Amino acid sequence: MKKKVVIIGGGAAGMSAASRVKRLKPEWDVKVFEATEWVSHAPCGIPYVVEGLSTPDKLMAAGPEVFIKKRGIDLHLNAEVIEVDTGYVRVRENGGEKSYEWDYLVFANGASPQVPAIEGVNLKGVFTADLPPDALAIREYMEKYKVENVVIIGGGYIGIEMAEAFAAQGKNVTMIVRGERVLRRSFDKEVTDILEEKLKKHVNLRLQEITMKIEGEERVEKVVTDAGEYKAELVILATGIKPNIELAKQLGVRIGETGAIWTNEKMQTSVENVYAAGDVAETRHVITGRRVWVPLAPAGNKMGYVAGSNIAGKELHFPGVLGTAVTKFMDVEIGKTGLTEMEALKEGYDVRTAFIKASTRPAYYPGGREIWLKGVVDNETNRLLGVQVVGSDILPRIDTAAAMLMAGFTTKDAFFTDLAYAPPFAPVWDPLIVLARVLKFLE
Amino acid sequence: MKKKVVIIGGGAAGMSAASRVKRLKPEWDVKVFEATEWVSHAPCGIPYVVEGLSTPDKLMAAGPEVFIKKRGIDLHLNAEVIEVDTGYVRVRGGEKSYEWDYLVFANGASPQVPAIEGVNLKGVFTADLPPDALAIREYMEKYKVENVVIIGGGYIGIEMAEAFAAQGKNVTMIVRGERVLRRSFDKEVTDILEEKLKKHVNLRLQEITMKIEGEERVEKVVTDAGEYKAELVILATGIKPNIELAKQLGVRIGETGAIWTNEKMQTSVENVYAAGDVAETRHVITGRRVWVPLAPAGNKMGYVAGSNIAGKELHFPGVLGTAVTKFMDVEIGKTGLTEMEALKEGYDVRTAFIKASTRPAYYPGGREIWLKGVVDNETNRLLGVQVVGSDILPRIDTAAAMLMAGFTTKDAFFTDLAYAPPFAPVWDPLIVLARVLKFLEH
Ligand SMILES: Cc1cc2nc3c(=O)[nH]c(=O)nc-3n(C[C@H](O)[C@H](O)[C@H](O)COP(=O)(O)OP(=O)(O)OC[C@H]3O[C@@H](n4cnc5c(N)ncnc54)[C@H](O)[C@@H]3O)c2cc1C
Ligand SMILES: Cc1cc2nc3c(=O)[nH]c(=O)nc-3n(C[C@H](O)[C@H](O)[C@H](O)COP(=O)(O)OP(=O)(O)OC[C@H]3O[C@@H](n4cnc5c(N)ncnc54)[C@H](O)[C@@H]3O)c2cc1C
Ligand SMILES: CC(C)(COP(=O)(O)OP(=O)(O)OC[C@H]1O[C@@H](n2cnc3c(N)ncnc32)[C@H](O)[C@@H]1OP(=O)(O)O)[C@@H](O)C(=O)NCCC(=O)NCCS
Ligand SMILES: CC(C)(COP(=O)(O)OP(=O)(O)OC[C@H]1O[C@@H](n2cnc3c(N)ncnc32)[C@H](O)[C@@H]1OP(=O)(O)O)[C@@H](O)C(=O)NCCC(=O)NCCS
């Protein structure tokens, strides 16, 4: 008969799972509790609302009424799950604080930014960019106060996307990076260097620097590091994120080695009838089989879909991820899929690599631009372990490579794949195919 | 020890194979005979040189000296192979014979000549090799051309129409069929390109051209429907493989009309290979033999043939029929089988046709993109994908990989495809397509 399903969080994962369950079991009572006023939202668009490319209401996919009226999901907004135990959840709503039973539970509860323990992080003008309310706050601050110098702490992709959003508004932007290069955790050097030459020109890039303090009157005026000081009337916090596991721990939910919630292929946790999905959830790597945490949106959506399916008695397996990701600074596109040279080495693979430059068009169609590719290959199988791409028109290479990795293509398999050619689209030898030829499969 | 290798034709296929052989066997005598002055040339760029996007010398990649001096290939330009027999080739001024131990037909395909009167008037052109682009340019400089007429609704017709429309000319398209590209795509896909095409070109469907009229020069085109003022005509009513020399050697011709080959690109005659637009190949999905005269396949075939000639065994799996082109801002392409082709092949099929956007609603510049999918009901495998609108390349190339590997609808759904707001919407259109199908179980 009928069950009560409860879902914690109204991001991509939560809504994916709610939609899916209700879709499969219309007669079921599917409740969602979302702490904010925002549902079906894209934190991925925050830099572009901040940059001013978009109005803040566009961050919402559909109307909460679509979920409630049209799809029949008992959506509670401004509802924080504060306690959780086996079969129960405790929630605060009208002010008021009330308990609800559940037969199935989903943690779709995301991840929030790491708070670096330096003094003055709580000044007015210090911001983290994680949910849509952050975009509103940043906009209202800049309207109330004249912000001219901005300082970004962190060289991850969020740092970079945020830097772009302020540089594009004519601001003086300074980036503080602990590492020897940007994005050093997720990409190899010869790839990140290409984005850096560009970044360095539009941003004061400060490598190998540890921020000690944020100083300021009623709110932020300066940032002090182990090297120098930097004028700043706005600070963007983005020094990594961590999964929101505190409620899970209350239920004794197994936490994976990554820090995120352990799941299997069906997105089940260690606790029966309890699932986890999205940025909170640890998953599987398609190439290594190791468990890994990749808090991105497409995976998050799929996990939600998968969890819902299984909750509703329709067995379905998530194979895992490839770590596929893309972003851009100005006209410089950057992305990967599969393992970097570093990751593959860490995993004990016997690897060979290649790094090549090519063009996006033939020399007889104009507008051809530079594109660079790095490939990583297991010497014992000739299989592609990963691909990194930087320059322009990278998406078809990344998406195509991703398919290839899903299927375990070799260098020879890639070479003979029937990829498309017309002069307006690409050069006669696709850059991905050139890469494949470079390595040259053998034995 | 050393062998004499001879290669007929200096297009993509010929040069691919010559480079490859010489690369593997530097001590071998590798001769190429190319009828024109052009080597390593791209007929694919002719519309854009005609449109004026490019100067005509950019149709050649590296100088002929790169091949001769730098790579050591005995390249003969302005050399037509006129006769061929077992072990010999006859070439032309001057006419002399050369021995061969291995032979490659890299000999392309030339346009079908429709047998209507006046096709040989000044101003009537075919667009197949680079000299054609030069001829078309010099004609337009010498004579004022204002009305252009294109015969044929294939991709060449369409690319040529764009090249004349973009120059402000009055362009009229005569098409025998009920729609453009009707041979290679389904209706609900071609219709999207047509709504656009119809606005910048006088599109005349279901019309058979009877006559080209003129004095010394073309002035008009007459069809079964009306007449059309015209000072320049493009004929693009299909192409056919150049097999006449092959027949002289008794080379097996496939059911398609092109030269039969196997995976190693060998013909029915020992030590004789074929590569490129002249060659019939294999279909990766159906296993049927098929002719797809396109450039990437042509290059690969050349590479494969060379490898095997030089004692390094290598197999070409075949093609998917992947292809893309564009009219103005309307991109069009496919990979794998259309609904029509799949039905012709006896598959039990289901399909889907969806519209999506290239960005999320919060990043601007999002445009419309439509996808058709064809799926075998007994395996859930993708048989083909068709795409029209904008930003189609990542869908087509990705789908192509998927077809190479035999992905199902579920395999596609769970593929880790990329997302950022500047690149695509949260649900990639390819993934939406896959979901639409829905993996069914017995
Ligand atoms: C600036 C930025 C840029 C990004 N860019 C990209 C990109 O380019 N590409 C990409 O693939 N991914 C990107 N991501 C990641 C992407 O936004 C997430 O992976 C995706 O939103 C995951 O959805 P989710 O539901 O798992 O978690 P989230 O979307 O983070 O949302 C979780 C929700 O749960 C709610 N919640 C938390 N605790 C409670 C509680 N106790 N009670 C009730 N509700 C609660 C929160 O209010 C929150 O709204 C980006 C993220 C950020 C912050
Ligand atoms: C207008 C047009 C647009 C195109 N657009 C696309 C596209 O968008 N995408 C795509 O993938 N493909 C396209 N193609 C196809 C592509 O150009 C060919 O597949 C490719 O050039 C094949 O190379 P090939 O050497 O096999 O044949 P070809 O390139 O035709 O070259 C064969 C050569 O052999 C020579 N030859 C012939 N007979 C003799 C003889 N007796 N002796 C000596 N030499 C001889 C010819 O002079 C010719 O140069 C297009 C073709 C045309 C004409
Ligand atoms: C949209 C959403 C809530 C997930 O719910 P969903 O209903 O599974 O997603 P969709 O709205 O695409 O799917 C609706 C249904 O219509 C179908 N559909 C029909 N025509 C379609 C078309 N032209 N395009 C897309 N989907 C179509 C879908 O395939 C799906 O099928 P189903 O009925 O078998 O489930 C979720 O993706 C979401 O929260 N999105 C916005 C926020 C976001 O993802 N941002 C994350 C961080 S950037
Ligand atoms: C170029 C052509 C002659 C084939 O020659 P090829 O040697 O097979 O291909 P390339 O010249 O690209 O390869 C040269 C070598 O350097 C390498 N290389 C080429 N470009 C490279 C790059 N950008 N970065 C790194 N390495 C590269 C290749 O891997 C190749 O390796 P090999 O030494 O193992 O052979 C053939 O493709 C051709 O005729 N092209 C012109 C025709 C055309 O483009 N269009 C035809 C119809 S539109």
Side-chain angles (χ1 to χ4, degrees):
Chain A
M1 310 174 189
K2 297 357 173 214
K3 306 289 199 185
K4 297 186 187 74
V5 178
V6 167
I7 297 161
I8 310 173
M15 293 300 108
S16 287
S19 302
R20 182 52 173 178
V21 167
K22 193 69 184 186
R23 179 86 172 146
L24 290 171
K25 294 286 197 180
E27 301 308 316
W28 287 15
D29 170 63
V30 179
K31 287 170 176 302
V32 180
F33 302 90
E34 166 55 56
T36 67
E37 299 178 0
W38 297 84
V39 176
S40 198
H41 60 78
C44 318
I46 291 169
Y48 307 111
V49 173
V50 169
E51 192 172 334
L53 295 176
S54 190
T55 67
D57 74 327
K58 297 258 196 319
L59 288 178
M60 269 193 75
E65 7 4 22
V66 163
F67 296 106
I68 300 158
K69 222 158 138 220
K70 254 178 49 134
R71 289 186 177 188
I73 301 161
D74 188 2
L75 175 58
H76 294 129
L77 285 171
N78 299 355
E80 190 182 342
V81 174
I82 63 171
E83 189 192 324
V84 61
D85 216 37
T86 246
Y88 272 165
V89 95
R90 235 338 212 196
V91 187
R92 130 170 357 101
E93 293 188 34
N94 282 282
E97 217 181 346
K98 123 179 183 238
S99 285
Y100 293 144
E101 300 186 304
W102 58 263
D103 294 323
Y104 297 95
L105 189 72
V106 181
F107 287 99
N109 113 326
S112 46
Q114 290 178 356
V115 46
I118 70 94
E119 69 181 321
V121 294
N122 295 297
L123 293 180
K124 221 181 256 241
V126 192
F127 292 108
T128 70
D130 199 64
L131 294 174
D134 299 333
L136 296 177
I138 286 161
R139 292 285 299 180
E140 289 186 6
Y141 191 83
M142 300 185 94
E143 289 172 345
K144 263 334 177 168
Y145 302 105
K146 300 227 295 118
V147 178
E148 221 186 11
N149 306 283
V150 177
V151 166
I152 311 301
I153 320 228
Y157 85 101
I158 292 170
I160 294 156
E161 270 184 345
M162 293 323 255
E164 171 172 46
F166 291 115
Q169 299 180 324
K171 275 105 192 95
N172 181 3
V173 183
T174 306
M175 258 183 156
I176 309 303
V177 179
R178 260 163 129 194
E180 43 183 31
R181 54 198 186 78
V182 296
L183 295 168
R184 71 185 163 89
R185 195 173 295 276
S186 46
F187 292 77
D188 298 321
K189 196 199 182 233
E190 57 264 64
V191 170
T192 55
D193 289 355
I194 311 246
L195 185 105
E196 278 190 12
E197 287 186 10
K198 190 72 191 165
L199 192 55
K200 283 190 254 185
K201 292 171 188 171
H202 302 81
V203 154
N204 187 22
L205 182 50
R206 310 302 302 165
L207 303 168
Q208 309 195 4
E209 289 195 25
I210 303 90
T211 243
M212 306 306 201
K213 211 203 266 181
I214 294 161
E215 291 187 21
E217 183 65 13
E218 184 266 309
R219 25 147 208 201
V220 63
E221 8 180 342
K222 156 174 80 173
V223 173
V224 186
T225 70
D226 63 353
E229 300 185 344
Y230 305 102
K231 185 84 191 175
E233 304 83 59
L234 191 149
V235 186
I236 298 299
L237 282 192
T239 65
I241 48 162
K242 76 191 175 301
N244 307 345
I245 56 172
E246 291 307 315
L247 292 167
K249 285 197 283 175
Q250 283 183 351
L251 257 182
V253 163
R254 180 180 169 183
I255 309 302
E257 247 5 334
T258 53
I261 293 171
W262 176 93
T263 63
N264 64 12
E265 288 185 324
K266 298 193 283 285
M267 302 287 101
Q268 295 162 337
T269 64
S270 54
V271 182
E272 200 178 19
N273 301 334
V274 181
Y275 290 65
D279 280 7
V280 75
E282 175 192 38
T283 192
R284 235 192 125 258
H285 204 277
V286 171
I287 297 166
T288 69
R290 256 166 228 240
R291 295 202 184 280
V292 7
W293 183 47
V294 188
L296 297 177
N301 274 73
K302 289 169 195 179
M303 292 184 225
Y305 190 84
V306 170
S309 307
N310 293 291
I311 289 159
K314 185 171 159 130
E315 183 167 22
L316 190 57
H317 300 222
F318 183 63
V321 301
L322 289 168
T324 307
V326 291
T327 54
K328 103 180 167 113
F329 181 76
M330 296 181 66
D331 63 353
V332 181
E333 302 167 35
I334 184 82
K336 64 161 183 72
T337 186
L339 308 176
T340 68
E341 183 178 358
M342 198 196 115
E343 290 164 340
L345 288 172
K346 284 210 154 158
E347 297 281 338
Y349 288 97
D350 173 10
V351 307
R352 62 174 180 270
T353 64
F355 185 57
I356 54 154
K357 183 177 81 169
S359 186
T360 62
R361 310 283 183 239
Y364 52 92
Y365 198 44
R369 295 183 65 79
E370 295 158 339
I371 188 182
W372 292 261
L373 290 77
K374 189 190 175 113
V376 183
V377 170
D378 183 358
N379 275 325
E380 280 150 20
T381 57
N382 287 287
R383 274 193 191 118
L384 296 166
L385 296 176
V387 178
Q388 293 170 1
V389 186
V390 69
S392 39
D393 292 335
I394 74 169
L395 182 56
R397 283 156 213 89
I398 300 235
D399 275 357
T400 294
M404 292 185 170
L405 297 175
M406 284 301 286
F409 274 16
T410 68
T411 61
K412 192 168 57 53
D413 297 315
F415 183 72
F416 287 120
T417 292
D418 182 19
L419 297 186
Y421 170 68
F425 294 86
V428 62
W429 296 95
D430 200 78
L432 194 51
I433 291 181
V434 174
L435 176 61
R437 172 174 190 178
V438 177
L439 322 137
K440 328 159 294 201
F441 167 66
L442 63 162
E443 67 311 55
Chain B
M1 310 174 191
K2 348 294 202 220
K3 306 289 198 185
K4 297 186 186 74
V5 178
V6 167
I7 297 161
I8 311 173
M15 292 300 107
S16 285
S19 301
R20 182 52 174 178
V21 167
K22 192 68 184 186
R23 179 85 174 146
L24 290 171
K25 294 287 197 180
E27 303 307 318
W28 286 15
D29 171 62
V30 179
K31 287 170 176 302
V32 180
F33 302 90
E34 165 55 55
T36 67
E37 299 178 1
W38 298 84
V39 174
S40 197
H41 58 77
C44 318
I46 292 169
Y48 306 112
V49 173
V50 169
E51 193 173 335
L53 295 176
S54 190
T55 67
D57 74 328
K58 298 248 183 351
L59 297 176
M60 292 177 72
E65 27 337 41
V66 162
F67 296 105
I68 299 158
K69 216 152 148 224
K70 252 177 50 134
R71 288 185 178 187
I73 301 161
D74 189 2
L75 175 58
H76 295 129
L77 284 171
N78 299 355
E80 191 183 342
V81 174
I82 64 171
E83 189 191 323
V84 61
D85 215 40
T86 244
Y88 272 165
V89 95
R90 234 342 211 193
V91 188
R92 126 167 0 101
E95 221 179 346
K96 117 180 187 239
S97 284
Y98 291 145
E99 300 185 305
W100 58 263
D101 295 323
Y102 296 94
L103 189 73
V104 181
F105 288 99
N107 159 36
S110 45
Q112 291 177 355
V113 46
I116 69 96
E117 71 180 321
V119 294
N120 294 297
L121 292 180
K122 221 180 256 242
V124 191
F125 291 108
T126 70
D128 199 64
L129 294 174
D132 300 332
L134 296 177
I136 285 161
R137 291 285 299 180
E138 289 186 6
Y139 191 84
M140 300 185 93
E141 288 172 346
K142 228 143 222 331
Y143 302 105
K144 302 233 290 133
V145 178
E146 220 187 14
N147 306 285
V148 177
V149 166
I150 311 301
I151 319 228
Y155 85 101
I156 292 171
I158 295 157
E159 269 186 344
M160 293 322 255
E162 171 171 45
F164 290 115
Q167 299 179 325
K169 273 112 205 29
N170 182 3
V171 183
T172 306
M173 259 184 158
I174 308 302
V175 179
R176 260 163 129 194
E178 43 183 31
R179 54 198 186 77
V180 297
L181 295 168
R182 71 184 163 89
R183 195 172 295 275
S184 44
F185 292 77
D186 298 321
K187 196 199 183 231
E188 58 265 64
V189 170
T190 55
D191 290 354
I192 312 244
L193 186 106
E194 278 189 11
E195 287 185 11
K196 190 72 190 166
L197 193 55
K198 283 190 257 185
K199 291 171 188 171
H200 302 81
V201 154
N202 187 22
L203 181 50
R204 309 302 301 164
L205 303 167
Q206 310 194 1
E207 289 196 23
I208 302 91
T209 245
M210 305 307 202
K211 211 204 266 181
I212 294 162
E213 291 188 20
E215 86 314 346
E216 194 264 1
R217 277 183 333 163
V218 63
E219 7 175 336
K220 156 174 80 172
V221 173
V222 186
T223 69
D224 64 354
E227 301 185 346
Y228 304 103
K229 184 84 191 174
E231 304 81 59
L232 192 150
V233 185
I234 300 303
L235 301 164
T237 65
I239 49 163
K240 76 191 175 301
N242 307 344
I243 56 173
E244 291 308 314
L245 292 167
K247 285 199 283 175
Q248 282 185 351
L249 257 181
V251 162
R252 180 180 169 183
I253 309 302
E255 252 357 335
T256 51
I259 293 171
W260 177 92
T261 64
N262 64 10
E263 288 186 323
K264 298 193 282 285
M265 300 288 100
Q266 294 161 337
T267 64
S268 53
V269 182
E270 200 178 21
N271 302 334
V272 181
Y273 289 66
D277 281 7
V278 76
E280 175 192 38
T281 192
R282 234 192 126 257
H283 203 277
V284 171
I285 297 166
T286 69
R288 255 166 229 241
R289 294 202 184 280
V290 7
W291 183 47
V292 188
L294 296 176
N299 274 72
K300 290 169 194 180
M301 291 185 225
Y303 190 84
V304 170
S307 305
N308 293 292
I309 289 160
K312 185 171 159 131
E313 183 168 23
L314 190 57
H315 300 224
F316 184 63
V319 301
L320 289 169
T322 305
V324 291
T325 53
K326 103 180 168 116
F327 181 76
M328 296 181 64
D329 64 350
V330 181
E331 302 167 35
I332 184 82
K334 64 160 184 73
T335 185
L337 309 175
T338 68
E339 183 178 358
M340 198 198 121
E341 291 165 339
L343 289 171
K344 282 216 165 150
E345 298 282 338
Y347 288 96
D348 173 10
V349 307
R350 63 175 180 269
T351 63
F353 186 57
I354 54 154
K355 184 176 81 169
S357 184
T358 63
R359 309 284 182 240
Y362 52 92
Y363 198 43
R367 295 182 65 80
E368 295 159 338
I369 188 181
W370 293 261
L371 290 78
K372 189 190 176 113
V374 183
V375 170
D376 183 356
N377 275 325
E378 280 150 19
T379 56
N380 287 287
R381 274 193 191 119
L382 296 166
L383 297 176
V385 178
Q386 293 169 0
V387 186
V388 69
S390 38
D391 292 336
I392 74 168
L393 182 55
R395 284 157 212 89
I396 299 234
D397 276 358
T398 295
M402 292 185 170
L403 297 175
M404 285 300 288
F407 274 16
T408 69
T409 60
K410 192 168 57 53
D411 299 316
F413 182 71
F414 287 119
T415 293
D416 184 19
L417 297 186
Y419 171 69
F423 293 86
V426 61
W427 296 95
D428 202 76
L430 194 51
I431 291 181
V432 173
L433 176 61
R435 171 173 191 177
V436 180
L437 310 155
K438 248 194 266 60
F439 187 55
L440 301 171
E441 293 287 12
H442 199 285

